[PDB]
Amino acid sequence: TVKTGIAIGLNKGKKVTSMTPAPKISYKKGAASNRTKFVRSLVREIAGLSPYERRLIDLIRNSGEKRARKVAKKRLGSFTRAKAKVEEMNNIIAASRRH
């Protein structure tokens, strides 16, 4: 991570003595907590899925993951959200099959 000590190149910049400052707590925002995981599991167990997720599950089972990703991209925002949603539906069907 050290700079090369010249003005042009891949790690250009002055060669200084780094410090790696103490991480801020605000950088811990994406971290899952036991409280929120417990609440979310209980809430999903008491609420249940939505029509587009039901369609996604049946699409994964019958048509396939590529078509599921296409429809999830259409429903949700983007490809990253579609990927996360289709993988989540894969988790759901895995849990359903196991028990």
Partner 1 sequence: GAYKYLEELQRKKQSDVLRFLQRVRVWEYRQKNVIHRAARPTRPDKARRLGYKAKQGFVIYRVRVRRGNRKRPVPKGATYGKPTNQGVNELKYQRSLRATAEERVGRRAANLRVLNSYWVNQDSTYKYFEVILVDPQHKAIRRDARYNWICDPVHKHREARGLTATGKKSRGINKGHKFNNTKAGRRKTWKRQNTLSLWRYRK
Partner 2 sequence: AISKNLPILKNHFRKHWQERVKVHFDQAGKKVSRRNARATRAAKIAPRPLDLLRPVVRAPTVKYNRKVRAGRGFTLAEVKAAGLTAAYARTIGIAVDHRRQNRNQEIFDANVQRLKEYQSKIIVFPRNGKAPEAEQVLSAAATFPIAQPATDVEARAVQDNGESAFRTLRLARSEKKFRGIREKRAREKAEAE
Partner 3 sequence: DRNTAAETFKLFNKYRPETAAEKKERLTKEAAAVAEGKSKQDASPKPYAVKYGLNHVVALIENKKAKLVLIANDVDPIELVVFLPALCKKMGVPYAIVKGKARLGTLVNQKTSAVAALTEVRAEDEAALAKLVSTIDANFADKYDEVKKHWGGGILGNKAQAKMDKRAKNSDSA
Partner RNA sequence: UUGACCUCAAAUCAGGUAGGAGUACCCGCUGAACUUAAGCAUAUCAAUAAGCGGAGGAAAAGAAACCAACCGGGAUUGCCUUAGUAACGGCGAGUGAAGCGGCAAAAGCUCAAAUUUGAAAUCUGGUACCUUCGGUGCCCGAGUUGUAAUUUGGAGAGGGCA
Partner RNA sequence: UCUUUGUAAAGUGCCUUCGAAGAGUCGAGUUGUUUGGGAAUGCAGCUCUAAGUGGGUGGUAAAUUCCAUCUAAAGCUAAAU
Partner RNA sequence: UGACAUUGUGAAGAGACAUAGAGGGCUACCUUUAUAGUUUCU
* Positions in the binding site for RNA (CB under 7 A): 3, 12-14, 16, 18-19, 22, 24-36, 40, 50-52, 58, 62-63, 74-81, 83-85, 88
Q: Quick one: which of 4, 61, 59, 14 has its CA closest to 72?
A: 59
- Tell which positions 16-55 bind partner 2, by CB under 8 A: 16-22, 24
Binding partner at 40 among partner 3, partner 1, partner 2, none, C-beta below 5 to 8 Å by kind: partner 1
How big is the chain by its Cα radius of gyration, in Å? Answer: 22
Fill in the per-residue mask, 31 to 50: x = in contact with partner 1 (CB under 8 A), - = not in contact: ----xx--xx-xxx-xxxxx
Q: Can you tell me the distance from the alpha carbon of 89 to that of 95, in angstroms, rounded to the nearest whole number?
A: 10
Q: CB-based burial of residue 56 (10 Å sphere; 0-12 exposed, 13-18 middle, 19+ buried)? A: buried
62 binds partner 2 (CB under 8 A): no
Binding partner at 54 among RNA, partner 2, partner 3, none, C-beta below 5 to 8 Å by kind: none
Contact between residue 76 and residue 82 where contact means Cβ atoms under 8 Å apart: yes
User: Taking the complex as a whole, how short is the minimal distance between the CB of residue 99 and RNA, in angstroms?
Assistant: 20
Q: Can you tell me the distance from the alpha carbon of 68 to that of 53, in angstroms, rounded to the nearest whole number?
A: 10
